[PDB]
Design a protein around this ligand. Structure first.
Ligand SMILES: *[C@@H]1O[C@H](CO[C@@H]2O[C@@H](C)[C@@H](O)[C@@H](O)[C@@H]2O)[C@@H](O[C@@H]2O[C@H](CO)[C@@H](O)[C@H](O)[C@H]2NC(C)=O)[C@H](O)[C@H]1NC(C)=O
Ligand SMILES: *[C@@H]1O[C@H](CO[C@@H]2O[C@@H](C)[C@@H](O)[C@@H](O)[C@@H]2O)[C@@H](O)[C@H](O)[C@H]1NC(C)=O
Length: 178
């Protein structure tokens, strides 16, 4: 009936090393458990967008879920979600265990990219991608603009998955296949 609670959005140089996810505890309503959910999104050569949620929650079992939505080279999207049902269980402190050539405008930002310089695409990329990710729920409401060379096909940076712990995801994009 106590859980760590925090909602953070950040751009992160080296979130594997530096990110401190330890948060203050708060009392849940009865018949609520804890969750810790983080989503990390990166383009080639960019910083990493980090959506990190800790809260009391009423829906769900005690699964631990690790997903790679989209694989390098290029765009990378990865999540860790731990739902757990004893006081202060959502206590992960660190993201260490979690995280004729073509050219594409490349960037990541919360909101809108200030710029999207052109970068050469590695072997294995299928397309240029210009997308927008809409997040809602869990006190985590946000947009992420993502452009770059990617392995994903069409508007599938988030692999057609609608939700990430307490967050809902909508994806819209343009893409230019090779
Ligand atoms: C989350 O835990 C609650 C609390 O359960 C109690 O404490 C646990 C550590 C364990 O020892 C349980 O046996 C205890 O009951 C769960 O609530 C209970 O669930 C049972 C079975 O559905 C039900 O008949 C009891 O009356 C429930 N008690 C309350 C307070 O509602 C809850 O279901 C757990 N949820 C998950 C997803 O694990
Ligand atoms: C991470 O931070 C911990 C203490 O944090 C402080 O407590 C939390 C609840 C935050 O609200 C923060 O703003 C406070 O200053 C440290 O005890 C812990 O050791 C830190 N981890 C590392 C690896 O440095």
């Amino acid at each position: 009936t106590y859980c760590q609670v925090s909602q953070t959005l950040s751009l992160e140089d080296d979130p594997g090393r530096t990110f401190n996810w330890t948060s203050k505890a708060e009392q849940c309503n009865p018949g609520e458990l804890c969750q810790e959910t983080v989503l990390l999104i990166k383009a080639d050569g960019t910083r990493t967008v980090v959506l990190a949620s800790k809260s009391c929650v009423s829906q769900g079992g005690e699964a631990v879920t690790f997903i790679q939505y989209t694989a390098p080279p290029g765009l990378v999207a990865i999540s860790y979600s731990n739902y757990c049902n004893d006081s202060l269980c959502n206590n992960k402190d660190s993201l260490a265990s979690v995280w004729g050539t073509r050219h594409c405008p490349t960037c990541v930002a919360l909101g809108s990219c200030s710029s999207a310089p052109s970068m050469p695409c590695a072997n294995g990329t299928t397309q240029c991608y210009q997308g927008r990710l809409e997040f809602s729920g869990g006190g985590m409401d946000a947009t992420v603009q993502v452009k770059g060379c990617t392995t994903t096909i069409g508007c599938r940076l988030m692999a057609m998955i609608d939700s990430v712990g307490p967050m809902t995801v909508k994806e819209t994009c343009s893409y230019q296949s090779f």
